[PDB]
Design an enzyme around this catalytic site. Structure first.
Site, mmCIF file in Angstrom:
data_model
loop_
_atom_site.group_PDB
_atom_site.id
_atom_site.type_symbol
_atom_site.label_atom_id
_atom_site.label_comp_id
_atom_site.label_asym_id
_atom_site.label_seq_id
_atom_site.Cartn_x
_atom_site.Cartn_y
_atom_site.Cartn_z
ATOM 1 N N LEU A 50 -33.126 -8.954 -2.855
ATOM 2 C CA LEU A 50 -34.378 -8.652 -2.179
ATOM 3 C C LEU A 50 -35.377 -9.676 -2.713
ATOM 4 O O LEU A 50 -35.743 -9.630 -3.887
ATOM 5 C CB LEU A 50 -34.839 -7.238 -2.526
ATOM 6 C CG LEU A 50 -33.882 -6.162 -2.035
ATOM 7 C CD1 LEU A 50 -34.410 -4.793 -2.400
ATOM 8 C CD2 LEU A 50 -33.722 -6.294 -0.529
ATOM 9 N N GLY A 51 -35.813 -10.580 -1.839
ATOM 10 C CA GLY A 51 -36.711 -11.664 -2.213
ATOM 11 C C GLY A 51 -38.147 -11.406 -2.599
ATOM 12 O O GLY A 51 -38.823 -12.282 -3.150
ATOM 13 N N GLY A 52 -38.644 -10.215 -2.301
ATOM 14 C CA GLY A 52 -40.032 -9.906 -2.617
ATOM 15 C C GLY A 52 -40.330 -9.868 -4.100
ATOM 16 O O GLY A 52 -39.972 -8.915 -4.809
ATOM 17 N N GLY B 239 -34.555 -9.349 -9.438
ATOM 18 C CA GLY B 239 -33.366 -9.633 -10.230
ATOM 19 C C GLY B 239 -32.094 -9.323 -9.467
ATOM 20 O O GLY B 239 -31.848 -9.871 -8.396
ATOM 21 N N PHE C 298 -34.668 2.126 1.218
ATOM 22 C CA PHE C 298 -35.290 0.817 1.353
ATOM 23 C C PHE C 298 -36.647 1.064 2.003
ATOM 24 O O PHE C 298 -36.737 1.799 2.977
ATOM 25 C CB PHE C 298 -34.427 -0.074 2.248
ATOM 26 C CG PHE C 298 -34.990 -1.436 2.458
ATOM 27 C CD1 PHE C 298 -34.823 -2.428 1.494
ATOM 28 C CD2 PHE C 298 -35.733 -1.727 3.599
ATOM 29 C CE1 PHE C 298 -35.388 -3.688 1.665
ATOM 30 C CE2 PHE C 298 -36.302 -2.982 3.779
ATOM 31 C CZ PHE C 298 -36.129 -3.965 2.808
ATOM 32 N N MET C 299 -37.704 0.479 1.451
ATOM 33 C CA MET C 299 -39.049 0.669 1.993
ATOM 34 C C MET C 299 -39.409 -0.555 2.805
ATOM 35 O O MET C 299 -39.632 -1.636 2.271
ATOM 36 C CB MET C 299 -40.049 0.882 0.858
ATOM 37 C CG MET C 299 -39.784 2.148 0.027
ATOM 38 S SD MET C 299 -40.549 3.652 0.692
ATOM 39 C CE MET C 299 -39.571 3.900 2.109
ATOM 40 N N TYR D 247 -41.878 -2.194 4.092
ATOM 41 C CA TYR D 247 -42.859 -3.224 3.756
ATOM 42 C C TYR D 247 -42.961 -3.800 2.334
ATOM 43 O O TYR D 247 -43.943 -4.467 2.018
ATOM 44 C CB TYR D 247 -44.249 -2.767 4.212
ATOM 45 C CG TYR D 247 -44.357 -2.587 5.706
ATOM 46 C CD1 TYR D 247 -44.491 -1.321 6.270
ATOM 47 C CD2 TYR D 247 -44.277 -3.682 6.563
ATOM 48 C CE1 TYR D 247 -44.539 -1.151 7.646
ATOM 49 C CE2 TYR D 247 -44.325 -3.520 7.940
ATOM 50 C CZ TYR D 247 -44.453 -2.253 8.473
ATOM 51 O OH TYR D 247 -44.492 -2.090 9.835
ATOM 52 N N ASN E 143 -43.195 -4.247 -1.971
ATOM 53 C CA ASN E 143 -44.091 -3.756 -2.999
ATOM 54 C C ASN E 143 -45.524 -3.744 -2.501
ATOM 55 O O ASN E 143 -45.892 -4.533 -1.634
ATOM 56 C CB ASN E 143 -43.974 -4.581 -4.301
ATOM 57 C CG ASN E 143 -44.562 -5.973 -4.185
ATOM 58 O OD1 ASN E 143 -43.896 -6.911 -3.748
ATOM 59 N ND2 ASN E 143 -45.817 -6.114 -4.582
ATOM 60 N N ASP F 100 -45.350 2.124 -16.808
ATOM 61 C CA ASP F 100 -45.612 0.841 -16.177
ATOM 62 C C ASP F 100 -46.175 0.989 -14.770
ATOM 63 O O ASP F 100 -45.723 0.329 -13.839
ATOM 64 C CB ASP F 100 -44.346 -0.018 -16.167
ATOM 65 C CG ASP F 100 -44.647 -1.481 -15.912
ATOM 66 O OD1 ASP F 100 -45.814 -1.883 -16.100
ATOM 67 O OD2 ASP F 100 -43.730 -2.231 -15.532
ATOM 68 N N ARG G 176 -47.556 -3.572 -8.395
ATOM 69 C CA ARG G 176 -46.258 -4.262 -8.266
ATOM 70 C C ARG G 176 -45.083 -3.274 -8.346
ATOM 71 O O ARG G 176 -43.955 -3.594 -7.950
ATOM 72 C CB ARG G 176 -46.082 -5.324 -9.367
ATOM 73 C CG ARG G 176 -46.235 -4.779 -10.802
ATOM 74 C CD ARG G 176 -46.029 -5.863 -11.885
ATOM 75 N NE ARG G 176 -46.185 -5.278 -13.212
ATOM 76 C CZ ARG G 176 -47.352 -4.979 -13.764
ATOM 77 N NH1 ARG G 176 -48.492 -5.234 -13.128
ATOM 78 N NH2 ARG G 176 -47.381 -4.350 -14.934
ATOM 79 N N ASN G 177 -45.347 -2.080 -8.862
ATOM 80 C CA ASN G 177 -44.309 -1.080 -8.975
ATOM 81 C C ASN G 177 -44.342 -0.008 -7.875
ATOM 82 O O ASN G 177 -43.586 0.964 -7.924
ATOM 83 C CB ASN G 177 -44.355 -0.424 -10.361
ATOM 84 C CG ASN G 177 -43.519 -1.165 -11.363
ATOM 85 O OD1 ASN G 177 -42.393 -1.558 -11.066
ATOM 86 N ND2 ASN G 177 -44.055 -1.360 -12.564
ATOM 87 N N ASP H 93 -40.184 2.040 -10.278
ATOM 88 C CA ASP H 93 -40.186 1.379 -11.575
ATOM 89 C C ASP H 93 -39.056 0.366 -11.520
ATOM 90 O O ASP H 93 -37.871 0.722 -11.628
ATOM 91 C CB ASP H 93 -39.958 2.379 -12.705
ATOM 92 C CG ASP H 93 -40.089 1.733 -14.068
ATOM 93 O OD1 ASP H 93 -40.175 0.492 -14.120
ATOM 94 O OD2 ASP H 93 -40.102 2.450 -15.088
HETATM 95 C C1 PRC Z 1 -32.217 -0.166 -6.192
HETATM 96 C C2 PRC Z 1 -33.124 0.580 -7.147
HETATM 97 C C3 PRC Z 1 -32.533 0.967 -8.372
HETATM 98 C C4 PRC Z 1 -33.260 1.677 -9.339
HETATM 99 C C5 PRC Z 1 -34.587 2.007 -9.149
HETATM 100 N N1 PRC Z 1 -35.251 2.757 -10.134
HETATM 101 C C6 PRC Z 1 -36.508 3.189 -10.175
HETATM 102 O O1 PRC Z 1 -37.346 2.968 -9.307
HETATM 103 C C7 PRC Z 1 -36.921 4.036 -11.295
HETATM 104 C C8 PRC Z 1 -37.884 5.068 -11.089
HETATM 105 C C9 PRC Z 1 -38.278 5.903 -12.160
HETATM 106 C C10 PRC Z 1 -37.694 5.698 -13.435
HETATM 107 N N2 PRC Z 1 -36.770 4.702 -13.605
HETATM 108 C C11 PRC Z 1 -36.378 3.881 -12.581
HETATM 109 C C12 PRC Z 1 -35.216 1.621 -7.924
HETATM 110 C C13 PRC Z 1 -34.474 0.896 -6.933
HETATM 111 N N3 PRC Z 1 -35.147 0.550 -5.758
HETATM 112 C C14 PRC Z 1 -35.666 -0.670 -5.526
HETATM 113 N N4 PRC Z 1 -35.670 -1.611 -6.525
HETATM 114 C C15 PRC Z 1 -36.185 -2.853 -6.340
HETATM 115 C C16 PRC Z 1 -36.731 -3.195 -5.092
HETATM 116 C C17 PRC Z 1 -36.722 -2.227 -4.072
HETATM 117 C C18 PRC Z 1 -37.248 -2.464 -2.748
HETATM 118 C C19 PRC Z 1 -37.887 -3.669 -2.385
HETATM 119 C C20 PRC Z 1 -38.380 -3.841 -1.068
HETATM 120 C C21 PRC Z 1 -38.220 -2.792 -0.139
HETATM 121 N N5 PRC Z 1 -37.605 -1.644 -0.509
HETATM 122 C C22 PRC Z 1 -37.120 -1.450 -1.765
HETATM 123 N N6 PRC Z 1 -36.184 -1.002 -4.346
#
Ligand code: PRC
Length: 275
Positions: free
Chosen positions: A24-26, A30, A93-94, A96, A98, A139, A143-144, A157
């Site tokens: 995911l490039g946004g 990682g 997946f959201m 739009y 972050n 955190d 950005r989160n 997160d």
């Molecule tokens: C794939 C994934 C794995 C673990 C967590 N974990 C957390 O979000 C979290 C929350 C609370 C405590 N610890 C971890 C979240 C995700 N979701 C996740 N991660 C990065 C980008 C995106 C993303 C980017 C753009 C659009 N939609 C989703 N989603």
């Protein structure tokens, strides 16, 4: 897996059920890829881990935490793959991305004053839930957060302290900290509480009110604490309503016990959400 078995886990799912694409490039998170859950033809987000052996324990403690939380404003966990090698953690997946980039790239006539307030109300709701659950975020920052259809906003997160290829997370003993979002006591005594999340929320409000500007613009990290001790605080952003700013101010009280709880912050916003 089968309900007939020790440690049956309803969250475990089969990898073959998901089609992997590319990261995911946004802001780029990682090792997180866009994927599809064939069954429901749903696009999903999949955080992986396969050779980063150091994480395993931590990658697994994350999965466990996400199983313990559910709220309409918290990124929804869909399933895990904590059995065989290539570990996964599937989330919705959201559409739009972050919230930080969203705010910076949005049509401001659409994302108007009432929409910003709506976004802050949703976030405070998720945090009131976490406060009740006695969970600490550590955190909280734009950005989160993630944005969906109809300005739906969810707190997440992404474990970005590792990504920081810039000035966002300044190092502090093998541990990176987003200094400009960190409460005084967390910087001084390294004490993290739900009241330090409240401090971070105040900064998150400032981010939203300015459509994504960087906190304490121009000021160098090394003088942020001293400035805060001398009672310096960011000024009301242009166009920011007085009631909202006053809330920002309450979140930035030097003494954590003087900071409002998320329950009252949420109530303040709902009320304010009138008109
Ligand atoms: C794939 C994934 C794995 C673990 C967590 N974990 C957390 O979000 C979290 C929350 C609370 C405590 N610890 C971890 C979240 C995700 N979701 C996740 N991660 C990065 C980008 C995106 C993303 C980017 C753009 C659009 N939609 C989703 N989603």
């Amino acid at each position: 897996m089968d309900p007939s078995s020790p440690n049956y886990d309803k969250w475990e799912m089969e990898r073959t059920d998901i089609t992997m694409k590319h990261k995911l490039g946004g802001g780029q998170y990682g090792e997180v890829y866009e994927g599809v859950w064939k069954k429901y033809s749903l696009t999903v987000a999949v955080k992986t881990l396969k050779e980063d052996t150091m994480e395993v324990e931590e990658f697994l403690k994350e999965a466990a935490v996400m199983k313990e939380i559910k709220h309409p404003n918290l990124v929804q966990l869909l399933g895990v793959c904590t059995r065989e090698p290539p570990f996964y953690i599937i989330t919705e997946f959201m559409t739009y991305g972050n919230l930080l980039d969203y705010l910076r790239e949005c049509n401001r006539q659409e994302v108007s004053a009432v929409v910003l307030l709506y976004m802050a109300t949703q976030i405070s709701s998720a945090m009131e839930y976490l406060e009740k659950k006695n969970f600490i975020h550590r955190d909280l920052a734009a950005r989160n957060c993630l944005v969906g259809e109809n300005h739906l906003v969810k707190v997440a997160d992404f474990g970005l302290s590792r990504l920081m290829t810039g000035d966002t997370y300044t190092a502090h003993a093998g541990a990176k900290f987003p200094i400009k979002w960190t409460a005084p006591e967390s910087l001084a005594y390294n004490k993290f509480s739900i009241k330090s999340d409240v401090w971070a929320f105040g900064v998150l409000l400032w981010e939203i009110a300015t459509y994504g500007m960087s906190p304490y613009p121009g000021i160098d990290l090394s003088q942020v604490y001293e400035l805060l001790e001398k009672d310096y605080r960011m000024e009301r952003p242009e166009g920011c309503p007085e009631k909202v700013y006053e809330l920002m101010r309450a979140c930035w009280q030097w003494n954590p016990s003087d900071r409002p709880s998320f329950a009252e912050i949420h109530q303040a916003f709902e009320t304010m959400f009138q008109e």
